[PDB]
Structure formats: structure tokens, C-alpha cells
């Protein structure tokens, strides 16, 4: 039988699993695209 | 009022069109349909003659009338076999229920066939008004016979017109006097024939005469209608038509359902008919019966007067005991409109009309208010 009253899903499926992270310092999965005309500089920074 | 004097005189110039369907002559007419075809065209033309009234007058809005042809035939048989054609009128509006135009149809096959007007509940009116009532009936020269259907009356507290101002008893001596010989020779009993409107006691009266309840309340929808006769006297038979309504005239459309013309249990636009009960009663009279203490007339906040409105009566009567609406409570005016208009016709909210005269009607009408009550001291 059908759902009888349509409604959107509760929650987001691209954020599974809800499991505890491996470390309190979260990793950076990806850095910006390299542009080798510009001078040398860093891409991120650590802080509290 | 200026509005009262003009709208009375407009009706008098148009009274001649109303007539009836009249049964044109049929001498032998042996027929499967040729008597029926002969009788259609009289009512079909009479239906057309009332249709021209709507173009002729503006805001003329007249009484409903029996548009069914078969109801009119039941009038035709009763007016034919009877030597006396009799009209029952209410006494609260004596001019309205009477039709003078039907009496023209009585004198057609006359051989001294007569007209009679018997008018009920005379004890309700007063002693003073019936003296003023007796002047108009003789001046148009038809009849006036008041009565009240009680075997023992309780009417506690110049001869010329005051001799018939007393109404009559329960006696049938007053129908016994007009016609002594019969119009057909062979039957020993004569007959009398009764014609009146529904919601006027043509069934309430002659229930009490025969005492066996043969006349009972109005007929079924699925039938033709009926026609019934009853024998009660040494020397008269009774006949009554199925109750129907004659097209005389109507004004303001509220007075119809305020009287017994239109049904109270079917009404739309209750503001008009509840407005007519408002001004035609004084304030402390309703305050004695129901005990409403209405006042609320805005009484030096918006205007000057002691007159009521259609709103503030229905609200205050139903701001008493209960009567609230769904969703939000705003006092439920239309439910209270039934119980006031039913007490108008039943006679708790009694009123007497001005007697008719050529154009004029008074602003200050005669009244009746008893100072005593079972609760008021």
C-alpha cells in the first residue's frame, strides 16, 4: 500500500555513518588547486 | 408616515385583475379529453393574466397562489354544490384573508346564493376595537360575524352597530338564518361550503362542531389533493375545500410569514420579519412575558429614541438561557427567530391592525397591555 501522505525524509544520507571520529584533530580531505605562477604561501592553519 | 400613505393607495388601482379560473360552459361535453382541454384554457389564460402584473407594478410582491390546476378544481366542486359559500378570516388581519373577488364568482350562478364572513377569536382583540371594526364591514356591505371557538366563554371585564359587536356563541343558528329553501329540490338537507386559507383555523373550528375530528390537518403531497364533506345538523351539510391561497396582494414580504401565509420553519432573511415584531409591541410587555431586560438601545450614545431594532431583540432574547453558535459564541440570532415568530402567530405576541380607510393609516395605533401578571405585582 502507498504511503497515503507524502513527506520528505528525516535526516541526511550523505553523512552516514554517525560514528565517532578517529581523532579530535579533524583531517583536511582536500587542498585548493595549485597555481604555480604565485609566490610560496601556506594553505591552512591550526588554531584553538 | 409618508411611506405608509403612498404604498396603500397603489394597491387600490390594481385590484381588478386578480380574478379566478371560472369554468366556462360545458353543456353536455361527453369527452375523453374535450372537457379537460376546455378546462385547461381557463386556468392557462388566468395564469397569463397574473403574469402581466409583474411588468405593470414594481415591488408588488404578492402572496403565493395555488399554481397547481387540480387544487383549483376542488374549489369548483365546492362552490357549485353549495348554496352558501363561506369565508374564514383571522381577525388579526381581517382585510387580507378575505377575497371580495371570489364573491363575484358566487353571484354568477346565484338564485340568491349568498356570501358569509365568519371571523374568529374576537375575545382576544378588546371591547373598544370591535366597535371601530363594525363600521367598515357594513359600509362595503358583505357580512360580519365574529366568533370564538369556546363552549364557555371567559370574556371577564347606541344599539345600531353595537348589537352585533358581541361575537356569537358556539351555536349554528347564524348559518341557519340566511337560506331557508334548498337550491336543488330533491335533497332534504341543503349544504354549506367552507373556503379559507391554511394556518387559519378552518380545521380548528369545525373539529369542535362535529366533535369527531374528520377535518384533520393539511393533505398529503402525493395525491391529487382531496375533497371532503361532513353531515352535522338536522338541516345543513358541511363541505370544505382543501385549503388554498388567493392572489389578493402583499406588502413588504415580512407580513406574510409574520402572519400564517408563509411557513416559519422555511424562512430566509429573518431580519425583516423579526423587525416587524420589534416596533409593533411596547418594551415592558415582552419584559413581562420573557423577562429579558433588553435595554441596549444605545440610549444617548448614538441616537435618540426608545424604538427597538431587529438585531438587539433576537440577541438579547438568546443572550438569555442558551443559544450559541459553533466555533465562536455570537448569540445565534436565527434560532431565536423561530420561537418569537411562533409566539406571534399563537397569540402571545398579539397585535391589532388599523381598520382600513381610503388611504390613511395612523402613526399611533390602539394597544392592549394588561398591567397584571402572575409574576408581576
Amino acid at each position: 500500500s502507498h504511503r497515503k501522505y507524502e513527506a520528505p525524509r528525516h535526516g541526511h544520507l550523505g553523512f552516514l555513518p554517525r560514528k565517532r571520529a578517529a581523532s579530535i584533530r579533524a583531517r583536511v580531505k582536500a587542498f585548493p588547486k595549485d597555481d604555480r605562477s604565485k609566490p610560496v604561501a601556506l594553505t591552512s592553519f591550526l588554531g584553538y | 408616515n409618508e411611506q405608509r400613505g403612498n404604498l396603500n393607495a397603489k394597491q387600490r388601482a390594481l385590484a381588478k385583475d386578480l380574478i379566478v379560473p371560472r369554468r366556462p360552459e360545458w353543456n353536455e361535453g361527453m369527452s375523453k379529453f374535450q372537457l379537460d382541454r376546455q378546462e385547461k384554457e381557463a386556468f392557462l389564460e388566468w395564469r397569463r393574466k397574473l403574469a402581466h402584473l409583474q411588468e405593470s407594478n414594481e415591488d408588488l410582491l404578492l402572496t403565493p397562489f395555488e399554481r397547481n390546476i387540480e387544487v383549483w378544481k376542488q374549489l369548483w366542486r365546492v362552490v357549485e354544490r353549495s348554496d352558501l359559500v363561506v369565508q374564514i378570516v383571522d381577525a388579526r388581519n381581517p382585510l387580507l384573508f378575505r377575497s371580495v373577488d371570489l364573491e363575484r364568482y358566487v353571484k354568477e350562478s346565484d338564485d340568491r346564493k349568498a356570501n358569509l364572513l365568519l371571523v374568529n377569536k374576537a375575545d382576544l382583540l378588546t371591547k373598544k376595537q370591535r366597535i371601530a371594526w363594525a363600521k367598515y364591514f357594513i359600509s362595503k356591505n358583505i357580512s360580519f360575524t365574529f366568533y370564538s371557538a369556546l363552549r364557555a366563554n371567559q370574556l371577564l371585564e347606541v344599539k345600531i352597530l353595537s348589537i352585533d359587536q358581541l361575537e356569537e356563541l358556539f351555536l349554528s343558528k347564524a348559518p341557519n338564518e340566511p337560506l331557508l329553501p334548498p337550491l336543488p329540490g330533491q335533497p332534504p338537507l341543503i349544504n354549506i361550503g367552507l373556503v379559507g386559507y391554511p394556518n387559519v383555523g378552518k380545521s380548528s373550528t369545525i373539529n369542535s362542531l362535529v366533535g369527531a375530528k374528520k377535518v384533520s390537518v393539511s393533505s398529503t403531497p402525493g395525491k391529487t389533493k382531496h375533497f371532503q364533506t361532513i353531515k352535522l345538523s338536522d338541516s345543513v351539510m358541511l363541505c370544505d375545500c382543501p385549503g388554498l391561497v388567493f392572489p389578493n396582494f402583499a406588502y413588504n414580504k415580512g407580513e406574510l410569514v409574520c402572519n400564517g401565509v408563509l411557513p416559519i420553519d422555511q424562512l430566509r432573511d429573518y431580519i425583516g420579519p423579526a423587525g416587524l415584531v420589534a416596533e409593533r409591541i411596547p418594551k415592558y410587555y415582552i419584559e413581562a412575558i420573557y423577562g429579558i431586560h433588553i435595554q441596549t438601545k444605545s440610549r444617548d450614545e448614538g441616537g435618540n429614541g426608545d424604538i427597538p431594532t431587529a438585531q438587539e431583540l433576537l440577541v438579547a432574547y438568546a443572550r438569555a438561557r442558551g443559544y450559541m453558535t459553533q466555533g465562536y459564541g455570537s448569540a445565534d440570532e436565527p434560532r431565536a427567530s423561530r420561537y418569537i415568530l411562533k409566539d406571534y402567530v399563537n397569540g402571545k405576541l398579539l397585535y391589532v391592525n388599523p381598520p382600513p380607510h381610503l388611504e390613511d393609516d395612523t402613526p399611533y395605533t390602539r394597544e392592549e397591555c394588561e398591567e397584571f401578571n402572575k409574576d408581576l405585582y
Binding site: - | L61, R67, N68
Partner: protein, 52 residues
């Protein structure tokens, strides 16, 4: 508009499926205004009394 009618048995068809047998020219004034497309949007259906 269009109003259906039993030629033999004198009935009136309501919009869904009904066959209300009404008295002719008395209360058909009351059975039509359901079938009419117009609803309660029109002001106050103050009066209605059909002509011949």
C-alpha cells in the same frame, strides 16, 4: 444550463446521481441552485422567484 427530466415519471437529476422527484414549479427553485456552477461567492442571493 441544462436540467435533466423524467418524461414519464417526473423526476429531476442532481449533479452526482440523484433523482429527486419534486413538485413542478414549486420547489424546483430550490433544487437548481445546487446544480448551478455559481456558489456562495455571489453577494446575498437575496431573492429568487421564477417567472412563467
Amino acid at each position: 444550463a441544462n436540467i435533466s427530466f423524467c418524461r414519464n415519471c417526473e423526476r429531476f437529476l442532481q449533479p452526482p446521481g440523484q433523482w429527486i422527484r419534486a413538485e413542478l414549479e414549486s420547489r424546483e427553485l430550490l433544487a437548481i441552485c445546487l446544480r448551478r456552477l455559481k456558489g456562495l461567492t455571489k453577494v446575498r442571493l437575496v431573492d429568487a422567484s421564477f417567472i412563467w
